[PDB]
Design a protein around this ligand. Structure first.
Ligand SMILES: Nc1ncnc2c1ncn2[C@@H]1O[C@H](COP(=O)(O)OP(=O)(O)OP(=O)(O)O)[C@@H](O)[C@H]1O
Ligand SMILES: Nc1ncnc2c1ncn2[C@@H]1O[C@H](COP(=O)(O)OP(=O)(O)OP(=O)(O)O)[C@@H](O)[C@H]1O
Ligand SMILES: Nc1ncnc2c1ncn2[C@@H]1O[C@H](COP(=O)(O)OP(=O)(O)O)[C@@H](O)[C@H]1O
Ligand SMILES: Nc1ncnc2c1ncn2[C@@H]1O[C@H](COP(=O)(O)OP(=O)(O)O)[C@@H](O)[C@H]1O
Ligand SMILES: [Mg+2]
Ligand SMILES: [Mg+2]
Ligand SMILES: [Mg+2]
Lengths: 248, 397, 239, 16, 140, 232, 398, 238
């Protein structure tokens, strides 16, 4: 039929290899990014923590790439590492050439040309990876972009990608009041999203990986929440849920 | 030969708001039906007429005996003996009695035979086995071309095929073009093929025979082709007639080398259908209409120009046809003034006539949910995704 | 068979891969360009954003340069790639010749690039059709549809994408010389053309107007409502 | 090759 | 590992009426005969006393359902569907316990592997140490 | 329905994962209706003799029409009506003939009246498009796996006849079932009863339910961490 | 939000309030109309049901009763192997249809010379003695047959097969009307020829055309007719056909769609009968056979040399041929005298002749659509647009 | 089973045919017909428009183009393929005028375009070139030292001098008609009249201004296409 190499065109015009690359992201870990009034936070699921992973890492699903740019990845591990390396290369090449931090849109776009050229020609399989970029630039303040294995991208204020991403996005847009959420409320809403989108009666801070980007003192700080921070936040969430269920 | 059939009552359908114009017309119809009933009850009240010949008829009945079995006159011999097949399938060389109508004897017509020592003692011109009697339409369907939205080209083609030869056909032989013997409607499910067949059966002047395609297949050996032959013989006998075979792909699939007995019988039944389609001249006043969804799976001999010239396409409705269908099905609804119905049509989808009818029904159900009957636009809003169940988002932009 | 090969002619003589690429445009969005006496207008059907998409990065209308603008129908990534290549090439052209790039040259470059992408295995055709518009140095209104067969055609008022045929016939029944006498007349024509397919009105429509070298600004979502108000007023006026 | 087809059955009644 | 032997023992040590069948036996030649046999077996078990239906090699017919594209696969899936609808369908059965043995459970249709149809999915692993000693003793 | 001007809905399809209440809902409808319910569960319409399936469909609908407003339940409709296959040879055609007869009876030339029909399937996607078409099948009702609250209700119906103990928190048990079907919940109740029976008691405790949940919901996972770590 | 099911008061108020004031009257009136319609339908009756009773004075009821009490019925059967009688074993096994098969003997009224394998025979019911052979008779009224002696299709009515018609001429005209050249050339005239090609190419009528110009009668025999209900006796049928072929001065025997036969007990009987008729009849005769097929499924035992001397492929018509067919079919319809049939034939590449006839039919259809008694070139353009083809070819090719 | 050989240009049929190039030849008939006639006074090219929309600008459809003032071109086939061939033709003409400061024979023009063609199965395509046969048939007309000269170029690279050649959709019928129409003593005016008559009896639609493009080459003047008034003049007589 028309399921052959990506440089093929279905009679209906669809790009079947590209379609499968898009769809395969549902097998990856669930991760969302949200944009509060004064910050951008990426939450992600540690799908594989069996018993004996050293956790010798600073973050797994979140890869910082610039003093202004952080990213979350959902897809094949090899393509994830390659995309992160090329991201750092491009961002710092832009820094070297222009001596200004790379704008969000330019960086996301550059990855998108990479991905497109990797499905445009060459007889090579496209990257089966979806990215969530959070960052700041002096043009539009805080920005958050969601990429695509095909090579498309979009600006978003709240976006979940991975397994059970559709229902997570639906309940997120249901529980989103744009322009008026702080970082605390955004974190609480993200935790609600995670609790609803996981197959657990009670999500664990170990399974959850949250990194927050803020701007203060004229500098952008990208920091992953320590286990104490995430455990305190999740216990605040669970006691809030207890109050809510008692009120009903 | 005899004449056509499918009697129908008044269209009525001029008023619908139940404004006693309906009541007056319906009361007139009811009055006429009452005069029917009273007239025939009076005629049966007094009608003494019987006996007369008696003795000769009595002795011919004694000669015939009781019971009398019916068979099919398969072949004739010198004009005292013939070959007649019982309904079982066995045929015998039997004698022909004097009181039979030698002009009526033809290969195929049902013959009354003696129970013992089989011998042709009568001819039955109205055998019409219960199945084929069922396939003949008696009550015309209430749908009509008014109920059909869009499909103006399709209606034009079907009328040019089955109505124009029935009505004044002088254009046909004037141009010298033979009338189109048989027409196949096709398209995606729920486009209106069966609805168009209903509308044809409504505005008709010929015997309409509805068939299911899968109905033709019968368990017993040779029953299938025999039933197909009976159907087409009834069509010719009550000509002019229209033979509608819905879901022709029930038998119309590609012919392949049969292995089992059943598949051989199916091949025989389709071969008999094709032979009967070839049997009558296109100049004859008997037409066929076959509808299907999987046109691509049909045998490319059934749709030959020498067998079925026309091929009517039923595409998914366009936006204007969509709004036409919406207007048609919303005619009996008491829609409010807020409804616009334009948003549903403008949404790029694959709505069909069936889909639009279901959307209207579900909108009515949603209105009944809110204890209302005025049906807001929000009712349609919900109903659209209620009934429309099931390209990766931003890939194409 | 003969369909899964970009560079194999069918027995009847067709390049079926290129035809499939051509058809892939029809699954995009409606984009119509109308050239006026002193204006060139581009109307594009805008997808409705559900609740969160940032519309500042959903650009369906873009300008290759000051004197050239364009609308696309097809997959976004191909359009972005060809946009980058063509705008870089425009700057290279101005490196070579120092005069502003004419519409015909950039259109021919885009068509040649698509053709070279549609001439060997291991290279997928650019499944995008682009309506380019612009004024030359002397300000002649020009408009060209470029097609993934790597070709172009100079239309006075063309439509691409889904529903391209409907808008095309609307223009054929509506395109008149007097209809481009003023900018507002062309605006009325393009608004009616867009409303022919996008019956919602209000939003879901993006308009771009380029006059004699003003570096066109896309119509902000305040005066387009005024334009559809004028259209409705005229419609109720005639009847 | 991978045909593996089922089989139907059409009886013929017979008697005299 | 002992599946068919455990079934043999259960048949020996029971007052129930035992209907031993094998999955490949269900797949008949004539169209619709397989599902008819399934219906006949379950009807017989129902009409008799508390009965046991043992279907050795259930993966003959109960492999995971898929988009069958030919008559044979369609008929096999029809047999599987008839088995499902007979086991836990509209008309519930009373005192009819079914036993089915397979070597590859992971290939079975999930509709067959749900409670109400197959309440207990007992694994028969290879003998482990102590079990090996018991086997050696009881065969020696 | 007449006053609204709408057409009377005819068919309904119950589709969902294996074991959610579809057959249970049909049983309930049969129990709580005055209509002459008809159980025509799939593959009963597939006879060896040619054309007999279509004949039985015709007789079924004629007989339903002869009786009062009737309900026909086609359980596992996936069997006969799945999808018309191209051509014959090895393709299935007799079953497709029966399916086509069923389609025509459902919505054909005759337009049957008061023959509401219910069909059930675990795989709606593979059903023929001409069968899922509205007007033949309206209200394609989906039976999703029960959520936490619904699981609590299901536990409470299936634990109604048990001999519970004071201090039982069925809510915790329902929370112990991420995405478990109702059939699995009933199986959990049965296994808890079995655990109580093993110790020759009559009451069941919370730990009995916990280990019943562990046993019933047990499923084989991806042993190879390398395979499981392909995706991020 | 949990929606509330309608309660009894809800249902009662729904049926009223928002109702037309005439609801009860109208619905009741419609119900009585339907009831009265069913009343009339059940009471009107059936009527005759008039059996085939002859007019009186044609009745010999006395003799009819005599025949009823004297004459006896005979079941018919297909006689099978003769068992090599030689006047001492005259038994034959006969198959009475779907009934059984019995080995029986003759009645005294029939000689064994009248009985042979494969003929329908009427026999008694207990001894099953073959009482009378029942030849199936030959008549164009039954089935379909040659039904033609001098076809009305002439050499001017055929186009697009110039090489094919030339080959056919060499096949049939040269040996039939010019036997002297074959005789003095000392070469056996072509005993067998096959005409293979796709359906609708025109094959049949081509032979029919030469059948008009060969001064010999044309024979049409349909293989499906041999394989459908008219199976079995068909062998004997063609026997008689071949027999009548011998009776006439010259017969152009041709079998339509031999694929139904060339690719089955009685079918094989008909085949072997054809083999005997061809290989047995003297090749010097004048009843030369014309063979045609769509699927070159023919048994290898057929085209062995001495049975099929020549093969002719009927390919799709060319530009000249297609335009000739267009003009030929336009001769029979009311069109203008300035139609560019070359244009249309160009517009119909790889189109069968039957397709061309259908195109003309659709042109007439479109002319009727506009109620114009003269079809125009526009009408033919829409007809070819519809039939043929059942942006891409204009936005890339120019 | 022909199907095993139509896949790829580098395959030989059992009859030793080039099925791929034959399909490329058939791809011409998808294009519109082009007629070129050669006479003593010059060479004239008439091409249809096959317009799709009235809104289509006539200039955009280029069924006749000039390689040089002295030489005119007609093409039938893929428009992008034709444009590449035509740009190569103009480049090679400019190359000859650079090296020799002279205008080449049209025979040399077809020679160089042919070397651009028939390169599909050549190893020199490593930097990038045609991997498939070219999909346009060409018609060269001009006036050189040998007087008027007309050549017809086949996509396989075959070139033939022709007194009159019709290619495109209606190649066969137009060629057959010219076979009887053509006389070696044709004058330019009568030649153009005959060409327009052939178009009339070959065209699908009525001959108006916006269906026919027309070009002339004579030893005196250069390549000349008929302007709107000029084509109106050449169309009023017919
Ligand atoms: N053009 C139309 N206008 C109004 N109603 C329509 C139209 N087309 C279809 N419908 C509605 O669709 C319903 C079902 O249509 P119909 O029975 O003709 O289907 P079909 O297209 O023949 O499909 P199938 O043969 O696959 O069942 C009709 O009862 C009618 O109400
Ligand atoms: N929501 C529920 N409430 C109560 N009991 C339930 C529920 N879901 C399932 N069950 C019980 O679990 C079993 C499920 O079997 P059932 O056949 O009724 O389900 P189903 O979804 O129709 O399955 P199948 O796909 O096999 O038809 C039954 O014994 C039923 O009593
Ligand atoms: N637990 C056991 N005790 C005694 N013999 C055993 C045991 N398990 C296996 N066997 C031996 O192995 C065979 C097991 O057959 P079985 O396991 O029933 O086949 P399957 O597993 O394919 O149904 C028996 O014939 C028996 O001789
Ligand atoms: N050479 C021809 N001359 C005239 N008519 C032709 C020719 N070829 C085909 N036809 C048309 O094709 C139609 C069908 O031809 P037919 O002989 O039935 O096809 P086949 O050869 O398959 O039997 C005829 O009605 C005839 O009008
Ligand atoms: Mg229908
Ligand atoms: Mg075993
Ligand atoms: Mg069930």
């Amino acid at each position: 039929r028309y399921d052959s190499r990506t440089t093929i065109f279905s009679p209906e015009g669809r790009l079947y290899q590209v379609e499968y690359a898009m769809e395969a992201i549902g097998h990856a870990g669930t991760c969302l990014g949200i944009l509060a009034n004064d910050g951008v936070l990426l939450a992600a699921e540690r799908r594989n923590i069996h018993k004996l992973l050293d956790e010798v890492f600073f973050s797994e699903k979140i890869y910082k790439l610039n003093e202004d740019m952080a990213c979350s990845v959902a897809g094949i591990t090899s393509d994830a590492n390659v995309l992160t390396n090329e991201l750092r290369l491009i961002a710092q090449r832009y820094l070297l050439q222009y001596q200004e931090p790379i704008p969000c849109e330019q960086l996301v776009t550059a990855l998108c040309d990479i991905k497109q050229a990797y499905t445009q020609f060459g007889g090579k399989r496209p990257f089966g990876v979806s990215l969530l970029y959070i960052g700041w630039d002096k043009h539009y303040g805080f920005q958050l972009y969601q990429s695509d294995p095909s090579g498309n991208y979009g600006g978003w204020k709240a976006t979940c990608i991975g397994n059970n991403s559709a229902a997570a996005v639906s309940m997120l847009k249901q529980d989103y009041k744009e322009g008026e959420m702080t970082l605390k409320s955004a974190l609480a809403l993200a935790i609600k999203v995670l609790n609803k989108t996981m197959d657990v009666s009670k999500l664990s801070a170990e399974k959850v990986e949250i990194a927050t980007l803020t701007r203060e003192n004229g500098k952008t700080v990208i920091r992953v929440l320590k286990q104490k921070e995430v455990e305190q936040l999740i216990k605040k969430h669970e006691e809030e849920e207890a109050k809510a269920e008692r009120e009903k | 030969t005899k004449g056509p059939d499918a009697a129908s009552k008044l269209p009525l359908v001029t008023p619908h708001t139940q404004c006693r114009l309906k009541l007056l017309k319906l009361e007139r119809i009811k009055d006429y039906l009452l005069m029917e009933e009273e007239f025939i009850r009076n005629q049966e009240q007094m009608k003494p007429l019987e006996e007369k010949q008696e003795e000769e008829r009595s002795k011919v009945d004694d000669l015939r005996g009781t019971p009398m079995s019916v068979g099919t006159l398969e072949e004739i011999i010198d004009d005292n003996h013939a070959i007649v097949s019982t309904s079982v399938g066995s045929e015998h060389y039997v004698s022909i009695l004097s009181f039979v109508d030698k002009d009526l004897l033809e290969p195929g017509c049902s013959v009354l035979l003696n129970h013992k020592v089989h011998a042709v003692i009568g001819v039955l011109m109205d055998d019409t086995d219960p199945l084929v009697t069922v396939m003949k339409v008696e009550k015309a369907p209430q749908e009509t071309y008014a109920d059909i939205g869009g499909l103006d080209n399709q209606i034009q083609e079907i009328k040019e095929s089955v109505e124009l030869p029935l009505t004044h056909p002088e254009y046909y032989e004037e141009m010298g073009i033979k009338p189109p013997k048989g027409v196949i409607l096709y398209g995606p499910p729920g486009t209106g093929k069966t609805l168009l067949a209903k509308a044809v059966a409504n505005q008709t002047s010929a015997t309409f025979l509805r068939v299911v395609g899968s109905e033709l297949i019968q368990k017993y050996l040779g029953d299938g082709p025999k039933l197909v032959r009976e159907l087409f013989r009834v069509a010719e006998e009550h000509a002019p007639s229209i033979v509608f075979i819905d879901e022709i792909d029930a038998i119309g699939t590609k012919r392949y080398d049969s292995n089992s007995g059943g598949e051989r019988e199916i091949q025989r039944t389709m071969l008999e259908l094709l032979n009967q389609l070839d049997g009558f001249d296109s100049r004859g006043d008997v037409k066929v209409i076959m509808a299907t969804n999987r046109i691509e799976t049909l045998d490319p001999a059934l749709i030959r120009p020498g067998r079925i010239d026309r091929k009517i396409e039923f595409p998914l409705p366009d936006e204007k046809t969509k709004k036409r269908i919406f207007q048609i099905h919303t005619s009996r609804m008491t829609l409010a003034d807020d409804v616009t119905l334009d948003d549903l049509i403008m949404a790029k989808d694959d709505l069909s006539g069936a889909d639009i009818k279901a959307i209207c029904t579900e909108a009515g159900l949603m209105a009944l949910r809110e204890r209302r009957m005025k049906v807001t636009n929000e009712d349609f809003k919900k109903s659209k995704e209620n009934v429309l169940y099931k390209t990766p988002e931003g890939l194409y932009l | 068979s003969y369909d899964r090969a970009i560079t194999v002619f069918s027995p009847d003589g067709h390049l079926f891969q290129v035809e499939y690429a051509q058809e892939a445009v029809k699954k995009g969005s409606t984009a119509v360009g109308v050239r006026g006496r002193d204006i060139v207008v581009l109307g594009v059907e805008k997808k409705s954003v559900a609740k969160l998409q940032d519309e500042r990065t959903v650009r369906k209308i873009c300008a290759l340069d000051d004197n050239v603008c364009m609308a696309f129908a097809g997959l976004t990534a191909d359009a972005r790639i060809v946009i980058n290549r063509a705008r870089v090439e425009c700057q290279s052209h101005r490196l070579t010749v120092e005069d502003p790039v004419t519409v015909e040259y950039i259109t021919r470059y885009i068509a040649s690039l698509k053709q070279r992408y549609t001439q060997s295995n291991g290279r997928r055709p650019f499944g995008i059709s682009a309506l380019i518009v612009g004024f030359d140095f002397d300000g002649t209104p020009r408009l060209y549809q470029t097609d993934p067969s790597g070709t172009y055609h100079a239309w006075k008022a063309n439509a691409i994408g889904r529903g391209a045929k409907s808008v095309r016939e609307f223009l054929e029944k509506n395109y008149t010389d007097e209809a481009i006498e003023t900018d507002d007349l062309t605006i009325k024509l393009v608004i009616k053309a867009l409303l022919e397919v996008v019956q919602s009105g209000g939003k879901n429509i993006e308009l771009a107007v380029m006059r004699r070298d003003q570096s066109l600004k896309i119509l902000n979502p305040e005066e387009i409502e005024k334009y559809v108000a004028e259209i409705e007023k005229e419609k109720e006026e005639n009847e | 090759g991978n045909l593996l087809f089922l089989a139907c059955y059409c009886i013929g009644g017979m008697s005299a | 590992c002992g599946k068919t032997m455990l079934a043999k023992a259960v048949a020996h040590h029971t007052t129930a009426a035992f209907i031993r069948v094998v999955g490949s036996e269900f797949v008949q030649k004539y169209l619709g005969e397989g599902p008819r046999m399934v219906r006949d077996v379950f009807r017989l078990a129902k009409e008799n006393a508390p009965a046991i239906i043992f279907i050795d090699e259930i993966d003959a017919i109960a492999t995971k359902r898929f988009d069958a594209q030919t008559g044979a696969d369609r008929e096999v899936q029809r047999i599987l569907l008839e088995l499902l609808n007979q086991m836990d369908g509209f008309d519930q059965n009373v005192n009819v316990k079914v036993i089915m043995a397979t070597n590859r459970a992971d290939t079975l249709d999930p509709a067959l592997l749900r409670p109400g149809r197959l309440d207990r999915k007992i694994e028969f692993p290879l003998p482990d140490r102590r079990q090996k000693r018991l086997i050696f003793s009881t065969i020696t | 329905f007449e006053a609204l001007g709408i057409a009377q809905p005819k068919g309904v399809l119950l589709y969902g994962p294996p074991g959610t209440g579809k057959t249970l809902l049909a049983r309930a409808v049969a129990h709580h209706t005055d209509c002459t319910f008809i159980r025509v569960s799939g593959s009963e319409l597939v006879q060896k003799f040619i054309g007999e399936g279509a004949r039985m469909v015709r007789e079924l609908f004629v007989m339903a029409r002869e009786h009062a407003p009737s309900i026909i339940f086609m359980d596992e409709i996936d069997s006969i009506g799945s999808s018309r296959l191209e051509g014959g040879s090895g393709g299935d055609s007799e079953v497709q003939r029966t399916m086509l007869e069923l389609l025509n009876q459902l919505d054909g030339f005759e337009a049957t009246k008061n023959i509401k029909v219910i069909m059930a399937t675990n795989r709606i996607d593979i059903l023929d498009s001409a069968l899922l078409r509205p007007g033949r099948i309206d209200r394609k009702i989906e039976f999703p796996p029960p959520n936490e609250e619904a699981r609590l209700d299901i536990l409470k119906i299936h634990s109604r006849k048990m001999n519970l103990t004071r201090g039982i928190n069925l809510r915790k048990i329902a929370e112990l079932m991420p995405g478990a079907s109702g059939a699995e919940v009933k199986g959990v109740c049965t296994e808890a009863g079995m655990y109580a029976l093993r110790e020759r008691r009559v009451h069941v405790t919370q730990e009995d339910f916990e280990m019943a949940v562990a046993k019933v919901m047990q499923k084989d996972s991806e042993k190879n961490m390398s395979i499981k770590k392909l995706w991020k | 939000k949990p929606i509330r099911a309608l309660d009894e008061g809800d249902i009662a108020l729904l049926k009223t309030y928002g109702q037309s004031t005439y609801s009860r009257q109208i619905k009741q009136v419609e119900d009585d109309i339907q009831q009265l319609l069913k009343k009339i339908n059940e009471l009107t009756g059936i009527k005759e049901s008039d059996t085939g009773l002859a007019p009186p004075a044609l009745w010999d009821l006395a003799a009819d009763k005599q025949t009823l009490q004297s004459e006896q019925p005979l079941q018919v059967a297909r006689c099978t192997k003769i068992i090599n009688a030689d006047s001492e074993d005259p038994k034959y096994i006969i198959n009475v249809k779907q009934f059984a098969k019995f080995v029986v003997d003759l009645s005294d009224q029939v000689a064994p010379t009248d009985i042979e394998e494969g003929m329908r025979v009427g026999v008694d019911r207990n001894k099953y003695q073959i009482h009378i052979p029942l030849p199936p008779k030959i008549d164009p009224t039954v089935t379909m047959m040659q039904v033609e002696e001098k076809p009305d299709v002439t050499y001017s009515d055929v186009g697009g097969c110039k090489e094919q018609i030339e080959k056919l001429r060499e096949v049939v005209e040269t040996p039939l009307l010019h036997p002297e050249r074959f005789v003095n050339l000392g070469i056996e005239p072509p005993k067998g020829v096959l005409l293979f090609g796709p359906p609708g190419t025109g094959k049949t009528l081509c032979a029919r055309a030469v059948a008009n110009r060969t001064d010999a009668c044309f024979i049409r025999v349909i293989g499906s007719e041999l394989v459908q209900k008219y199976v079995g006796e068909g062998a004997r049928m063609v026997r008689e056909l071949f027999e009548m072929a011998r009776t006439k001065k010259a017969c152009l025997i041709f079998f339509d769609e031999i694929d139904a036969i060339g690719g089955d007990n009685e079918v094989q009987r008909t085949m072997l009968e054809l083999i005997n008729q061809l290989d047995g009849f003297d090749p010097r005769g004048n009843i030369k056979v014309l063979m045609a097929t769509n699927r070159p499924t023919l048994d290898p035992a057929l085209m062995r040399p001495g049975r099929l001397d020549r093969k002719i492929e009927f390919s799709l018509p060319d530009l000249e041929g297609r335009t000739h067919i267009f003009k030929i079919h336009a001769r029979s319809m009311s069109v203008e005298r300035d139609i560019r049939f070359e244009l249309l034939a160009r517009l119909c590449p790889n189109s069968t002749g039957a397709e061309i006839r259908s195109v003309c039919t659709e042109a007439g259809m479109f002319a009727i659509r506009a109620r114009r008694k003269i079809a125009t070139e526009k009408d033919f353009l829409e007809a070819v647009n519809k039939v043929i083809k059942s942006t891409p070819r204009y936005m890339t090719y120019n | 089973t022909r199907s095993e050989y139509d896949r790829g240009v580098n395959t030989f049929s059992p009859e030793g045919r080039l099925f791929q190039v034959e399909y490329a030849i058939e791809a011409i008939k998808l294009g519109s017909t082009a007629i070129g006639i050669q006479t003593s006074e010059g060479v004239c090219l008439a091409v249809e428009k096959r317009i799709t929309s009235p809104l289509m600008e006539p200039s955009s459809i280029e069924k006749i183009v000039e390689i040089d003032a002295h030489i005119g071109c007609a093409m039938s086939g893929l428009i992008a393929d034709a444009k590449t061939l035509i740009d190569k033709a103009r480049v090679e003409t400019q190359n000859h005028w650079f090296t020799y400061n002279e205008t080449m024979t049209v025979e040399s023009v077809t020679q160089a375009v042919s070397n651009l063609a028939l390169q599909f199965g050549e190893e020199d395509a490593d930097p990038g070139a045609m991997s498939r046969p070219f999909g346009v048939a060409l018609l060269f007309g001009g006036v050189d030292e040998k007087g008027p000269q007309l050549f017809h170029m086949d996509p396989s690279g075959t070139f033939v001098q022709c007194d009159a050649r019709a290619i495109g959709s209606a190649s066969e019928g137009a060629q057959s008609s010219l076979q009887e129409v053509y006389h070696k003593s044709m004058t330019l005016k009568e030649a153009i009249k005959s060409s327009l008559i052939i178009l009339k009896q070959v065209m699908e639609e009525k001959l108006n201004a916006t269906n026919i493009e027309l070009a002339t080459v004579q030893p005196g003047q250069n390549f000349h296409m008929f302007t709107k008034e000029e084509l109106e003049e050449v169309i009023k007589d017919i």
